[PDB]
Design a protein around this nucleic acid. Sequence first.
RNA 1: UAAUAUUUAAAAUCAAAUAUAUAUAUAUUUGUUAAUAGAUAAUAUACGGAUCUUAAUAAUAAGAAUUAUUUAAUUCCUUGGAAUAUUAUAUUUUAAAAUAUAAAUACUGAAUAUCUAAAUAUUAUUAUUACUAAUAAUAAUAAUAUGGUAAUAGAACAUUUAAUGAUAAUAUAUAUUAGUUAUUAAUUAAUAUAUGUAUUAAUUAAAUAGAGAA
RNA 2: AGGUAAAUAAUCUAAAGGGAAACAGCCCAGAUUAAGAUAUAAAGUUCCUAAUAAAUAAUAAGUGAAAUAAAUAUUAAAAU
RNA 3: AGUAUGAAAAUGAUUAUUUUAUAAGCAAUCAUGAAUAUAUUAUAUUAUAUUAAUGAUGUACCUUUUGUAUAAUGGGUCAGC
Lengths: 138, 118, 82, 118, 148
Amino acid sequence: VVKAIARNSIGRNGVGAFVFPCRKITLQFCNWGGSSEGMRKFLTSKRLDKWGQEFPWIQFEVMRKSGHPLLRAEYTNGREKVICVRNLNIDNVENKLKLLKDSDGDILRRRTKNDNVESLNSSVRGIWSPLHAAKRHR
Amino acid sequence: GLLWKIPWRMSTHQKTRQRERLRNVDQVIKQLTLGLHVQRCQDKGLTYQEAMESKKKYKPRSKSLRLLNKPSVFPKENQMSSKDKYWTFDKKAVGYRKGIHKVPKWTKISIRKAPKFF
Amino acid sequence: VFYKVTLSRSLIGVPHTTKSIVKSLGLGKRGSIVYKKVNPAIAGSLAKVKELVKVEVTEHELTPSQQRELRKSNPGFIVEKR
Amino acid sequence: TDTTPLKLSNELYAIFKIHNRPYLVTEGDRVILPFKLKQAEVGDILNMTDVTTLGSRNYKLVGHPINTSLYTLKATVVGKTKRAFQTREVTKRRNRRVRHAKSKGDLTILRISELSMN
Amino acid sequence: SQKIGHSGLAFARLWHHVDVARDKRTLGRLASAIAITLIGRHKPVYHPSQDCGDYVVVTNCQKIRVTGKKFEQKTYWSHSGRPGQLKLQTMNKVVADKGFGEILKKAVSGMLPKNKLRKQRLDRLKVFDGSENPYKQNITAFAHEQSS
RNA sequence: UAAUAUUUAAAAUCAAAUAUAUAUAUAUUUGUUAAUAGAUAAUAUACGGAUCUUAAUAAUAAGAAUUAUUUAAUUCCUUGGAAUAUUAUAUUUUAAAAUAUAAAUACUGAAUAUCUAAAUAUUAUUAUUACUAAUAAUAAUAAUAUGGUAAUAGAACAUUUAAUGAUAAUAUAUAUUAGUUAUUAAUUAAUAUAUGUAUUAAUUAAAUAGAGAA
RNA sequence: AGGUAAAUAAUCUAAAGGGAAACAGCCCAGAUUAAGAUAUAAAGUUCCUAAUAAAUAAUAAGUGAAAUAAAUAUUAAAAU
RNA sequence: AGUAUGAAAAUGAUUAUUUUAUAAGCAAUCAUGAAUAUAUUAUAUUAUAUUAAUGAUGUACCUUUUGUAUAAUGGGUCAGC
Ligand SMILES: [Mg+2]
Ligand SMILES: [Mg+2]
Ligand SMILES: [Mg+2]
Ligand SMILES: [Mg+2]
Ligand SMILES: [Mg+2]
Ligand SMILES: [Mg+2]
Ligand SMILES: [Mg+2]
Ligand SMILES: [Mg+2]
Ligand SMILES: [Mg+2]
Ligand SMILES: [Mg+2]
Ligand SMILES: [Mg+2]
Ligand SMILES: [Mg+2]
Ligand SMILES: [Mg+2]
Ligand SMILES: [Mg+2]
Ligand SMILES: [Mg+2]
Ligand SMILES: [Mg+2]
Ligand SMILES: [Mg+2]
Ligand SMILES: [Mg+2]
Ligand SMILES: [Mg+2]
C-alpha cells in the first residue's frame, strides 16, 4: 500500500518569475521641525518623481506627522524596515531610500565563516558512506 | 635568569629557508647587473632583445656592485660553504663560532665571508 | 629598461639608515611595487637594501592605474538589465 | 568532450567562481555573496562566465572557464542587505580608553534560477 | 546543498580490526594510526565538536614490534598525590602485569586530544594480547570479500 | 700486503666548480672523524606530552619523529626542454603487454601583501543635484594614509537650564520586549503607567554637563 | 651576576597578530572595518596540532628529538 | 525627617524553560548539535529569543611602574552625591 503524507511547496522567489521584494515606501515628514528639513527638500525636489518613474512596482506614500522624519518600507515577506532620517540632508535621505529599496525585507543576522549557499535541494551526489567509499579505511 | 629558549643548532627547515634567502639575495644582485648591462646596451644603440642576446655583457662600474659581483668578497650560495651558511665568527664563543640564527636580524642581515681561518 | 622593485620584507626592525634608503627608493609599504628607470645610482641604492627587496628587470614601466587593472580579478559574470 | 551523461541527468550541480570565490550550487539555491555589487541592481540577471565544474551524481565536466557554449547557468539578484551590526571592543591591558570597532559588512543575495546543459 | 540528505551511514561507527601479527608498523606509529581512527579524522564528515570516531579492535598484541632496548629500558610512571609514591615500571614489567594491550592503550591515550571526549575514544579501542576476542562477529565485512 | 709512529689538515697538495685569454694558463670558490665514560640532591618521570631507531616469511601497506649535506620525482643541456623512472587513469590486446592522458607548479602558516566590498582624510581626475557654482552636498575612478601611553589638534552625542517655538488622549513622557539606521544615540511595533499634555523639532547661549576606581 | 657604567642598532616603554610549550625586551610582522579566493613572512608538516614526500651518508647511545657540561680516559675510523 | 507615586538596582524566597551527579581553572567570545518559547505571510526543509551537550580560543579591572595573572595599590554589591 502507498499512503500520502501531506506537505506544502516552498517559494523560490527568483527561479520562475521574480517578484520585487520592496512594495511600499512611506516618506514621513513634518512641516515644523528642523530635523525634517532634508526630507522636506527631498519631497520638494522632483527626485521623488524620478524615483517613481524608475520603480513603478513599488508605491510611495507621503504622510505628514509631528515627530521626526521617517522612511518606513514594507516588503513581500511581511517585515517592515523603518529608518528615522533625523537631521539628514537631501542626498543622504536619497541614499537611505536606495538602501531600503535594495534590501529584501529579511531580518539581519550574523553569518559564520563561508556560509554562502542556502539550498533546500537534496545533495546531487549522496552523503558519504564508509561502506560505499572508493577507498576503504585500512 | 630569564629563559630565552633558542637552540644552538638550526632545524633542517630553518637551514633550507636560510639557503633560499641567500639565493634570493644573489638573484637580486644578478638582476641589478643585468639591468645595468641592458641600459648600457641601449645607450650604445641596441634594442632590448638584442641587449639580452649580446655575448659580451658589460660589467658594472659602480664600486659596490662590482664588489658584490666578486665571489671573493660576496660568495653566491652554490659557492658558499656549509660552515658559513649556518654559522658566523663570534670573537667570544667556544670554537669561535655561533649559529647565524643567533645574529639579531639574521633574516635581513647578509653576512657571508667569515675570516679565512676562523 | 626599468626595474620592478618590490619591498618583500618589512622595514620594522631595520636600522634607520636603511629605512631612509628605502623611503628614498619610493617604497612606502611592504609588498609595494615600484618601477624605476635603470641608471647606476638607482642600482647602487638597491644594492644597499638588497636583502629587503625583490627586483626584476622589465622592458616597459607601468602607471599605477595599469598595475591596478592587471591585478583586478575576473568577475565570473555578465550582467543583463531586465 | 562527450557531454551526454550530464545532458541526460535530472539533478546537476555547478561550482562557479565569482572573483575566484567558489560557490557550489544547484538550481533554486540562494548564494550569499559577501560584498556589494555595483554592476548588478536588484532584479538583474547574471550569466556566470566562469564555471569550474559541472557535475551529476557520477560524472563531472571540469575546466578553467569551461565553454559558455556547453551550459547555461544564470542567477538573478534578489537582495542587497547587510549582515548584522557588531561592536567588537578594542583595548589594551592597563589603559582605560577603548576603541569601539563597528562592523556591518554588506551582502549581495543571488538566486540560481537556471542551471542546465546547452 | 551537499550536506543535505540521509547522513545516518556517515556517522555510523565501524569496527576496524588490526592484526598486530600481520601488521609491521612499530608500536608508536601503529598507536598514532589508531588515534586518527578513534578521533574520526579519516572521515570527511568529521567536525571537532563531535565524537564520530570508529571502534578499533587490536588482536595479537603480543607480537607488537618495539625497537631498540625499549622493552627493558622504557619506563612508565605513576604518581599518587603523596610524595615518595612515584611508581616507575619498565615496559616489560607492565606487560607481565597487565599485557601488551595496556602498552598500546597508553600510547593511544597519549596520542588523543586532551578533552572530554578522550576517555570515550580510548574505551572505543579494544585490545587483546592473543588472537581470540568477543568482537570477531562485528568487524566490518563485505560480501565480495567472501572468497576466502 | 701485514706490522709500525704520528696527525684529525683543502694552508700546502689533489679533485671538482665559476670567472678571465681559452682542449691550456691565470685568478677565485668548495670538499678532511665517530661513539662511550667523565654526568650528580632533595614534592614527581620531565624531548611540552604520546612516543620515535624495523623485520625475512606476506600484506593494493610500515622502514627515524635523531645527527650532517641536499631536493621538491632522477639524469643531462641552457626559468625552459629532453630523456628516464614512478604513480594514477583510460583504451586495446593476451592477472600481464602495448597506446594515450595527467601529475610533477610540495604543503601549512599572521589582524603581512593582493583580490573582494565598506568607512574616513588628503592629492589628482570625473558624474549628478542646487543660483568663495573657482561653492556645497552625494556618488565614482586612481593613489597615499588610518596601533598607540604621556601629549597636541579637529568633530560629534547624552543630560539640565535661558532665548525663539508649531503640534496633540489616534497625543506625549517613562519603562520592558522584539525590530530598524555603520547604532555612547535615535527611531519603529506591541505592551504597562502617567499626563488635557512637551522649555518638544531646530539654531543659539550657557553649565553643579557624563563615574568601577580617591 | 636577571650586576654596574657608558657606546652603537633594534624592540619593549606606547605594539595587538604568527612563531619561540608558557614568554615586555628573541625571531617575523605594525590591527580603519569586514570578507576569506590568491601570494606568502618567521616558524613548522606521525598524533596531540593547521600541513610531507624524497635522496645520500653517520649514529645504537633513547645519544638525540627548541635551553649542546670541562679537562681527561677508553674504543673504534680515516690520513700520512 | 514635606505629600503622592514607584516593573531602578543591589538582596531574599518561589515557579517555569533549559543545562547539569567521569568532570578541573576570569565563567566570556567564536564554532556547534539538542530542547523549549513566541511569532495574524512558519508557504517550510521557517525566523527570532532562551539554554554551561560538545569543540576551539581566552592569565579580571584600575593604579604605579623598566616591567604586573601577579602572591604590588585600590575596591563587598547597588543607588545618589
Ligand atoms: Mg622566555
Ligand atoms: Mg603599561
Ligand atoms: Mg582596558
Ligand atoms: Mg626530574
Ligand atoms: Mg619539541
Ligand atoms: Mg592590512
Ligand atoms: Mg590613530
Ligand atoms: Mg558632576
Ligand atoms: Mg554610580
Ligand atoms: Mg566605565
Ligand atoms: Mg641591568
Ligand atoms: Mg611609563
Ligand atoms: Mg607583541
Ligand atoms: Mg616603534
Ligand atoms: Mg597599521
Ligand atoms: Mg633524550
Ligand atoms: Mg636539552
Ligand atoms: Mg604578563
Ligand atoms: Mg581590599
